[PDB]
Amino acid sequence: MNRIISINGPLVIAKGKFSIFEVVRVGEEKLIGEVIGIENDKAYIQVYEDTNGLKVGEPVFNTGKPLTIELGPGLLANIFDGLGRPLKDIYEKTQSIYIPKGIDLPTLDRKKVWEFIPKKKKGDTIKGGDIIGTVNENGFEHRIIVPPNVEGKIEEIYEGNFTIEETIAIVNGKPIKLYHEWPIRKPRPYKEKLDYNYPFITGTRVLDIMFPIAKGGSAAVPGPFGSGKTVLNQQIAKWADSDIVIYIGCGERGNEMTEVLEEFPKLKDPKTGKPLMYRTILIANTSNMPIAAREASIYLGATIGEYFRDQGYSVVVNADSTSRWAEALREISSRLGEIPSEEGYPAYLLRKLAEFYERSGRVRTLNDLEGSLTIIGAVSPPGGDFSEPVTQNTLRLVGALWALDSKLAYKRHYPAINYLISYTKQWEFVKKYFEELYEDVIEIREEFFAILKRESELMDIVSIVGPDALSDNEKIYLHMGRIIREGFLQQDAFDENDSYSPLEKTIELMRIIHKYYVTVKQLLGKIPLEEIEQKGIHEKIIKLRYKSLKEFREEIKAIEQEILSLL
Amino acid sequence: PSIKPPLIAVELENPMLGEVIDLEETKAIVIAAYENKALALLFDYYTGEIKQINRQGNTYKIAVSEDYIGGIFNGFGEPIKGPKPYPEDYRDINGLAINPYARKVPNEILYTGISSIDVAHPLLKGQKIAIFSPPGLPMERLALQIARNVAKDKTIIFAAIGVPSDIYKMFIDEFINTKAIMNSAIFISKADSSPIEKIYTPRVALTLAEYLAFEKNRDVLVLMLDMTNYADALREISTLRKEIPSRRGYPAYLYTDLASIYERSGLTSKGSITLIPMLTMPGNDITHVVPDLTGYITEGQYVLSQDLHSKNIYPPIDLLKSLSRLAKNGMSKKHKKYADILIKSYAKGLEARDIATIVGEDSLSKEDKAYLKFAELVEKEFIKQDYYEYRSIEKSFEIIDSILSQSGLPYSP
Amino acid sequence: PSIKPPLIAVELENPMLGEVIDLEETKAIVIAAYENKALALLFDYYTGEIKQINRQGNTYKIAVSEDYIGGIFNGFGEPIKGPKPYPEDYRDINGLAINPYARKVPNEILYTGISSIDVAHPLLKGQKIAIFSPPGLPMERLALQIARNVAKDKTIIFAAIGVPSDIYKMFIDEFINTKAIMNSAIFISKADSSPIEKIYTPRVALTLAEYLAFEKNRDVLVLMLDMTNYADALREISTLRKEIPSRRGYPAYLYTDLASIYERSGLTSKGSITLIPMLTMPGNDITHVVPDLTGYITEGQYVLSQDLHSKNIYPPIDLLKSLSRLAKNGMSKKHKKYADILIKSYAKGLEARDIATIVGEDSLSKEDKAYLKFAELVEKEFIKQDYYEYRSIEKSFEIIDSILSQSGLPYSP
Ligand SMILES: Nc1ncnc2c1ncn2[C@@H]1O[C@H](COP(=O)(O)OP(=O)(O)NP(=O)(O)O)[C@@H](O)[C@H]1O
Ligand SMILES: [Mg+2]
């Protein structure tokens, strides 16, 4: 007896009996929606589909559970929308390049035949989150963890080939599948939040040395348009030391999701040699797709990230970008007749953002294994003004700020990381890793910061004094700074040898620049800086990052030898 | 009832959002649906009473065919001159979002023959790239010049949004002269038209563009102007409701709405839609909501310089503010090197131009006057180019090698 | 009824403002009372129906005792781990304003062992002084370091307001390591908690603080963070009503509400409450409403410098922006002289640093390079100090006398 009484964009108000977070089928086409408010006999519903063309008298079909996601084999190397519907299957089922209104497809492949290898025997007792067995997912050991709900003794357990709906075990009268459904608005449980322990190693130097976060930490990547947010996130998604990579396309360009689909199968994981796609999951709700599904994609990718975390794996989530989620919330709030807060956004924006980043962390899983969820969030501040609510709210939630500079992007200095404004609040938790394996880089890191800072101060004097009218005790910082910038901080994402920078290459660059630094310092007064610069070297160090692993290591020796001081 | 042009209020049984209703002469679009109440926008100036109302069963749709090619229409797709295209297969003007799985990323350069574009920020087939112009700069001439050189085998679609007679006639007469109007379709919403016509202008143009490129297998070039007039039209409709406004009265969903237009483009296996949205930056402020949001959506932008224009330079394209995101995809190793040497040296030339304000010119580093010379020659020989001058990519390279030689910088010979 | 988390609307006979009402599992606070209508905030996430409602006869009150010491609680004072304190003598969490006649003005210095604090801007017992930090600076480490050295005989109360797990656990684990968690009480409101819990966090902490210090005769040190998160929580509740907003959506009574918290501290004949509110300056703008209003209320502030932090200096305390209003009360004649010579010479050193941008360093007055040297050494030897290094007030004086000597300035020996 349910009836739509109003249609206002992504908001539909309906009459009848509903629940506070119940999924509903809106209209004759049964469009997927979710109740978010109940005022008497009315229900306020956000529709994750296009609401245009909806008639008033149309019905609203009730369902049992809330908004969930299928957690099992069939996620890796695939692309899904905001509701976790397979975009490859959508294309084939419809034979069209466009996305239909209200298509209903199962998330995990129902026909794909997996091989299940049990890790538990008959008569064993099982807890929630226990690994009941494994499934090889194209080279990845997908650990079938039973729901936190499930406990008891194993009455039966099978082995061999099964589909996703077939029972592989029976525990206390109930069948156990290779997958389960979990509410995406509900953080998956774990035993204990663990201390930061290990540095989150990306492929990018500035994010590994200058402003690194710990495994399980979180970071914000804000910047104006064209600054480099997407590319930076994609670079992290490519080379990050992680078991599982989740890239969420939140309200952005379609081509950039396609871009991943074309390049990732071509690339190999440096740590395993395996193709990158087999560890990658793509969530795509582009800018011109249903705006309410932007929010869903955020929670969806988070729940999947927790899922693989609960298997005792390390997971990273890239959200590009979170501002589009904020726009969606702002829109819902408007239609709901809520009073706007700062810059139109609802007053509960900060808490909503918290519901995302607080999901991150290195934890003790229910099966007493160790897993971590690292969340990287891109922010798109209007006009590149960082003082806006979204950016500012985020900075009181995340562990580091990886700020992109409009001035640096203008110079084509990529990544355009502002090394002065950017920070990390997790250096003390990751320095132990470096203090052990590379004791001398702590000094060089401080040295690089000090040089860049001193070069910054000197730029005010230069513009109203003259760059060549300085002393050689000052010009050295402009000299060294340029080497640090063009040689270490900059990293060509679209170069073959430079795109990925392993710690070996990263540390060697630091060591050779430092080795060059102490040489120049003890050569002041004796030899002018002008004469020193004429002997190249500083130009040869800059180009080191463009050379291969073999070409690089030998050129280092050449530079070390070319440094002879005594002349 | 209730009526104040171009808005009317009336009672309907079960109102449909976006429903087309008929009066005596004109039509209307329902933009708000409460219970029995509804708000509708008139198609044009209507004097009569809002008595008898005929409700069409659906939202606004247009019949698609190749008949639009060679014709001039209004914002509703209706023929101005004459005389109705084949009324077959009606399509919702909003269309559908393209599955990114079904997409192919643009990798083929559409050479414009314009040095300031082709070298550093080339346009690719299926790419959406915008033009940012301060008030009074030859933005229209630039787009027209582009359309000549990149759409000789393609169908051109021009969506005129609220632009004065001076503007759209300039396009028409120029498509006529170059004989390219027979292979083109033009959709025009006058500055005094209903706001519902203005916002429908890009939608009907793209609905045809999607038909020609993805149902028929054609390469389409779509141009639209002015996107700032579009936002004004959208804000007018946004205001007519109870909608809570963002900054400057603009609707809070401006990004998504703009994205619902800019994203209707791209490359597939069958065809392609190359889209060039054009907008006037209010007060020459690129941080204004319209150019800002557009830059957050388009795959790059060509920024017109108020300074270069004062130097009598056409096209007044800012090499450093401009960007083509997908440019790298279609560039060769030699092409990438030339763009690199062009950008970094010109940028360094501008840096040397800034310090020339400090220590006088001729009283600086003898490489800083080299980059200074480089920047000047780039503006006066590379960037500066006649409206009727076409340059091959090799020609543009030669100019660079020439300039590099004159400036005492390393050149390839 | 009506329900959208964490807000509900319902009918009540004679609604009481601030009244606690009971549902099935969770409670609620009435924040608005018309005639028969009332608006209430849920204590947490509630899914059930708003059917049966049990109305407690009073507003939210907590039972006070010394049982809170050693325990960890939420924003409502409820025990997280376990396991309920002695439910005796309930107190309104808002408390009462202290009669200024019954007050004693703070005159005793609590030495922190931190040179950048103790010398020029010392903290006094019963004083309320805040920490202003730009995003990303070691604000939490500074407060923790302070708490070690000034609260060895005092009870520490930590009110965590909306801070991430990383933040409050940092405090807990640090109170555990230094064995100071057995002599402390911790109140925590998670970032996802109800806004009513967040604003109650400092109130329940101070209600206990007032009990321990003014009913029992103890010296209490209260720390709270983040006050910027508090304002956000208060604005969320302010928005849920019909309340007309001030700038940035913040309630117009933000000063008074903040004052209702900061003023709940001071010195009497029986005990004292030393309060250190901590806040993140949005966009590093001290003129933002939260740091501005806080500075209009607290008796000084320690301002963290984004510049000093870039110089790898901890603690990044700005000597000139920072202030301790009641500092003069506890300073001796020798102490006053050292603060004076420190402030005026460092300030003069910064002035000489500014003109060093004009006329180059080494090309200026031969007293201006002295103050320049002074400022540098102050930052690198006086201000800069290890997180585990404690300095006596004499030690800090010696450093000054040392720096003065190295800089060629008059020193006392
Ligand atoms: N590491 C890099 N190496 C080379 N080019 C880069 C690098 N990073 C960014 N770029 C360039 O920066 C330009 C803009 O990148 P992009 O990430 O799309 O900017 P953005 O607007 O900040 N992010 P988004 O809006 O989400 O696409 C691209 O054209 C890239 O070529
Ligand atoms: Mg993008």
Curated annotation (Swiss-Prot), chain A:
One of its GO terms (cellular component) is plasma membrane. It catalyses: ATP + H2O + 4 H(+)(in) = ADP + phosphate + 5 H(+)(out). It comes from the Archaea. Its EC number is 7.1.2.2. Its main location: membrane. It is found in: Cell membrane. GO terms for molecular function: ATP binding; proton-transporting ATP synthase activity, rotational mechanism; proton-transporting ATPase activity, rotational mechanism. Belongs to the ATPase alpha/beta chains family. Has multiple subunits with at least A(3), B(3), C, D, E, F, H, I and proteolipid K(x). Component of the A-type ATP synthase that produces ATP from ADP in the presence of a proton gradient across the membrane. The A chain is the catalytic subunit. NCBIfam families: PRK04192.1. This is A-type ATP synthase subunit A. The gene is atpA.
